[PDB]
Design a protein that fits this description.
part of a larger assembly; 7 chains; D: about 80 residues; alpha+beta; three-stranded mixed sheet; 1 helix; about 15% helix; globular; F: about 100 residues; two-stranded antiparallel ribbon; about 5% strand; RNA-binding; ribosome; RF1; RF3; 30S ribosomal protein S3; 30S ribosomal protein S13
RNA sequence: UUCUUCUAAAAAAAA
RNA sequence: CGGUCCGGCCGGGAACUCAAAGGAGACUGCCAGUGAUAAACUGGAGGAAGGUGGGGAUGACGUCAAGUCAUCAUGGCCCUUACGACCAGGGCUACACACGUGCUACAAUGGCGCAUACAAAGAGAAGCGACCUCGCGAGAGCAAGCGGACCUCAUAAAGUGCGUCGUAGUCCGGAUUGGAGUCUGCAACUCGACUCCAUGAAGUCGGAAUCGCUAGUAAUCGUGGAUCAGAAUGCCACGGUG
């Protein structure tokens, strides 16, 4: 590991924060801890549902969290049934009144987190890693992405010695700061250990 | 020019010369000269016997070499025969104020003894 | 009717004001010799005013903040040059040759991770 | 050392124990782990087994040990030399 | 170094006399960035040198410097199997640098009370063609003479 | 870190809040110059009887997500490793790699 | 007089917010001094990035706390009720201080 | 001009 | 400018320092020469900055089965009345020796005493803590202000002027040790920091060897912060001389 995190290095240029609120040092730590608890609970609950991003923001002593997911029908089901069930328990955990909005993610094949979860699920159900990597790259490149690079690492195909494989089509400029590289990772808990998946998606240079 | 039973220097200034006595540093010398009404920049020479007598009387109020060495040795001996931790550390010849001993204990241990 | 200039150096900021007069130099309501006891400082302050022969034909009202002795002195020189360039508008061709108009931008280099100072690396040992 | 205005420190259990000991006049050694307590005048002539991390070393309290802490007379490091 | 010969940086002259090489001298003499202390020392040394010489401080400093400036020095080449000390002529800036450095290092070794007094005595002896600084000059000259065969 | 260590931390912080007022009162009595020697003596004797874990000095700030006792940061409540992970993922607002 | 203090981690957001405040004051009443920029607090941290042992491998982070000051010289009732009832975007902290 | 030597256990892919 | 308790302090003024936000500006853009009618290089004109203006972030495919199963996650092996769990006391601070990285020095470019001048960047509510009184001092009592361009840490030091010391193991250097204390914390014995009095080892520029640095750099002088109840000569930043 040598390369700095792409979303971190772009946090003030082209990428927004996943939690946008203000807090003084007295309540900064417990606010961060509350954000961690709600993120952990949501990620645990909505495992089947393809959740891409959990944006948190707290205006005027009331938390409002907006989940970005590609399957809103699955997360809402019948109209207004489990969204309130999630909102009440989140408000109880944080101890402050909550409000949960949901943003649909158009084109889920170009979202770094969703591709990572898809690859990781396929790995967990034992498909050929090369096949999964090729399918993901072809689907992404067909939907109009300017470039994707995927990397899979560790005990591939039930081998004895771990190795790293990676593919890259198109441009993936990691040194260019204005390039909105969507980056995310995941991990598969297979019966031979844990396999790590990393994915960079270059959507086109942002001017300004 | 002879204070507390020992001979102090003469060409040196009074405030410096008084420190030669075992039991008198710079501040105590300053306090002595202040009580005796003697300036600090004057030397031990070109000073009257009456002034030197006042200096002797002033230094007499404190504890100087004779009983000071006795009481210091008495305290150290007290610790050693008392059997306290400081006593054991003193008799073993190692630092007693809780310093490191793995290295840098040269003042209490003397020069290095090579392995034979 | 005053003529103003601004001079800067390492961390200092000098504001100078020029008024025609006999040649009185006052810094922070103190004389030049009173404020800058260091002779090199006195020389660098007087350097533009003795390069162009206007030493006794005008008075200097100076106020300076931040920095150290040499920094404030250099800032004062920079301010005098900048103020003269607009007071006269023809002295620039000589001050530029003398290297007075240029703002010395050599700041103190920041300390860096792994280094003990700005550029001093810690002592290295092979064995 | 401890500030004078706060007074000396001694564990309450040890304090009750030495009180019972001086009242009944018994001469059995009082074993304790209280290495951090200062010596009081009534404790003279008593034998206290101070812990040293491994065993209870018996120490005979004399009148010259009042201002010290009990742990000074029960060394915890064992050393006999290197050669 | 390897790629580019850098451009020479400017030095402002001393305040009292407006001399360039005297300012260079104070730069060489300074230790721990205390230029003010170094300036006081050199000024006191010059002020007593003026009395002992009867000439102006600039002229006395220059005549003292001239007896310490070398004209040839040895430089290692080692093209053969051993160290070849080749005598090469010295350019003026380096000549002045060597003279000032030798004078300063000699004054730092003398046993007088103050550095100002040490520097004054060293300058007077140098003008008088004596001292360890001019001894070092004769030594390097003698070495260059003995190794004059290589060029 | 161990679950035992996290349990010790929560137990210590609970006892500290439980006995916070009494310890404060006792320390005020001891530190008071206008108090008799006997009441100050009783206060220093009473102070020992309280549970040791109730003192504020007994706790060591651990990372709220993993209980790591080293490399803590008070503003974030996490260790250096978790702070870096959270920063690079975007969970801590207004945080980014500085350069000057 | 009423003083409003705005604190935020995003400068573009705080600029938009302060422009909104002066606009909403200027519409209902008047006599707003102006949007004074107060000094930004740059709180820096330095953390070891290796999990076990690399003392010379560290990151240097900072949190810029941008600050703005606005105030109404003589506030009316239709100014004070409006700015009380009005709410702003998350990430901005307002501080009301009368007198 | 001279400048010697490093014993004895590794693993790497199979549309 | 009008007044002053002479203090930007107060009416005031929005010019300036400075505080942020937006924009302009540096691009071999122009000129001369060399060059293959090229890329490019050398020089100067303007300009605060000239060819990457200075510094930082940014570390390719991979290398060392490099480092971490003791941050965490995790496959397998091992223990389950113990290899799990709680508590007191001890140890991580031991000491014939060897090495690595520093701090303070061996002195007059200095030590001590008095007077005096110029900073930057941070932190602060279980917190920073003015002013006044007591103590030689560390500090204690009472106690305003400050969630902070306001108040506090906080008088920067080297410098400069005067006086003394006169090449000495010294008015250099502070180790070590005895006595008396302050603060934090239930609790300073092992094993904290600091203060007062006394003590004043080695050390007079360092063998073979070896390290950092090309400009605001090296060298040198202080200041702040993280960790933290208390506890840095370390680390991460900041300015002064240079």
């Amino acid at each position: 590991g040598q390369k700095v995190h792409p979303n971190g290095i772009r946090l003030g240029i082209v990428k927004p924060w996943n939690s946008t609120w203000f807090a003084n040092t007295k309540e900064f730590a417990d606010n961060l801890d509350s954000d961690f608890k709600v993120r952990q609970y949501l990620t645990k609950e909505l495992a089947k549902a393809s959740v891409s991003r959990i944006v948190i923001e707290r205006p005027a002593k009331s938390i409002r969290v907006t989940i970005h997911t590609a399957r809103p029908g699955i997360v809402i089901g019948k109209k207004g049934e489990d969204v309130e069930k999630l909102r009440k328990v989140v408000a109880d955990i944080a101890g402050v009144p909550a409000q949960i909005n949901i943003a649909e993610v158009r084109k889920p094949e170009l979202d770094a987190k969703l591709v990572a979860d898809s690859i990781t699920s396929q790995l967990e159900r034992r498909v050929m890693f090369r096949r999964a990597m090729k399918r993901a790259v072809q689907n992404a490149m067909r939907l109009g992405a300017k470039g994707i690079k995927v990397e899979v690492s560790g005990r591939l195909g039930g081998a004895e010695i771990a190795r790293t494989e990676w593919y890259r089509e198109g441009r993936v400029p990691l040194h260019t700061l204005r390039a909105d590289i969507d980056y995310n990772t995941s991990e598969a808990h297979t019966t031979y250990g844990v396999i790590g998946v990393k994915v960079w998606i270059f959507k086109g240079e942002i001017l300004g | 020019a002879r204070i507390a039973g020992i001979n102090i220097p003469d060409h040196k200034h009074a405030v410096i010369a008084l420190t030669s006595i075992y039991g008198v540093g710079k501040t105590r010398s300053k306090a002595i000269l202040a009580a005796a009404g003697i300036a600090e920049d004057v030397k031990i020479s070109e000073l009257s016997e009456g002034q030197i007598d006042t200096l002797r009387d002033e230094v007499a109020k404190f504890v100087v070499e004779g009983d000071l060495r006795r009481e210091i040795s008495m305290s150290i001996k007290r610790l050693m025969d008392l059997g306290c931790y400081r006593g054991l550390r003193h008799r073993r010849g190692l630092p007693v104020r809780g310093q490191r001993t793995k290295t840098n204990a040269r003042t209490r241990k003397g020069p290095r003894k090579p392995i034979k | 009717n005053q003529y103003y200039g601004t001079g800067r150096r390492k961390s200092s900021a000098a504001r100078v004001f020029i008024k025609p007069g006999n040649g009185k130099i006052v810094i922070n309501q103190r004389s030049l010799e009173q404020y800058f006891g260091r002779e090199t400082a006195r020389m660098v302050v007087r350097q533009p005013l003795e390069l162009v022969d206007m030493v006794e034909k005008l008075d200097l009202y100076i106020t300076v903040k931040g920095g150290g002795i040499s920094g404030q002195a250099g800032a004062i020189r920079h301010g005098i040059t900048r103020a003269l360039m607009e007071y006269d508008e023809s002295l620039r061709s000589e001050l530029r040759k003398a290297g007075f108009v240029t703002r010395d931008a050599r700041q103190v280099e920041r300390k860096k991770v792994g280094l003990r100072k700005a550029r001093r690396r810690p002592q290295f040992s092979k064995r | 050392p401890r500030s004078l205005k706060k007074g000396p420190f001694i564990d309450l259990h040890l304090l009750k124990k030495v009180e019972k000991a001086v009242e009944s006049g018994d001469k059995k050694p009082l074993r304790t782990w209280s290495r951090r307590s200062t010596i009081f005048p009534n404790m003279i002539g008593l034998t206290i087994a101070v812990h040293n991390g491994r065993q209870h070393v018996p120490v005979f309290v004399t009148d010259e040990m009042v201002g010290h802490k009990l742990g000074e007379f029960a060394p915890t490091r064992t050393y006999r030399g290197h050669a | 170094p390897r790629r580019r010969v850098i451009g020479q940086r400017k030095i402002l002259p001393d305040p009292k006399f407006g001399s360039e090489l005297l300012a260079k001298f104070v730069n060489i003499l300074m230790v721990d960035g205390k230029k003010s202390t170094a300036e006081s020392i050199v000024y006191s040394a010059l002020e007593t040198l003026a009395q002992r010489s009867g000439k102006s401080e600039l002229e006395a400093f220059e005549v003292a410097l001239e007896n310490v400036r070398p004209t040839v020095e040895v430089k290692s080449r080692r093209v053969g199997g051993s160290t070849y000390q080749v005598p090469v002529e010295v350019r003026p800036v380096r000549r002045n640098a060597l003279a000032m450095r030798w004078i300063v290092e000699a004054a730092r070794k003398r046993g007088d009370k103050s550095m100002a007094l040490r520097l004054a005595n060293e300058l007077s002896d140098a003008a008088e063609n004596k001292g360890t600084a001019v001894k070092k000059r004769e030594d390097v000259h003698r070495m260059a003479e003995a190794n004059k065969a290589f060029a | 870190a161990k679950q035992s260590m996290k349990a010790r931390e929560v137990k210590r912080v609970a006892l500290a809040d439980k006995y916070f007022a009494k310890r404060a009162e006792l320390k005020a009595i001891i530190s008071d110059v206008n108090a008799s020697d006997e009441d100050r003596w009783n206060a220093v004797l009473k102070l020992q009887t309280l549970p040791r874990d109730s003192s504020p000095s007994r706790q060591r700030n651990r990372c709220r997500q993993t209980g790591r006792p080293h490399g803590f940061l008070r503003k974030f409540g996490l260790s250096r490793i978790k702070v870096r992970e959270a920063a690079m993922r975007g969970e801590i607002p207004g945080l980014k790699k500085a350069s000057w | 007089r009423i003083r409003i203090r705005l604190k935020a981690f995003d400068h573009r957001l705080i600029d938009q917010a302060t422009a909104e405040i002066v606009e909403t004051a200027k519409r209902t009443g008047a006599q707003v001094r102006g949007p004074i920029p107060l000094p930004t607090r740059k709180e820096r941290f330095t953390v070891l990035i290796s999990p076990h042992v690399n003392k010379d491998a560290r990151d240097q982070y900072e949190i810029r706390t941008h600050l703005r000051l606005v105030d109404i010289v003589e506030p009316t009732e239709k100014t004070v009720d409006a700015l009380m009832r009005l709410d702003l975007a998350a990430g901005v902290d307002v501080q009301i201080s009368l007198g």
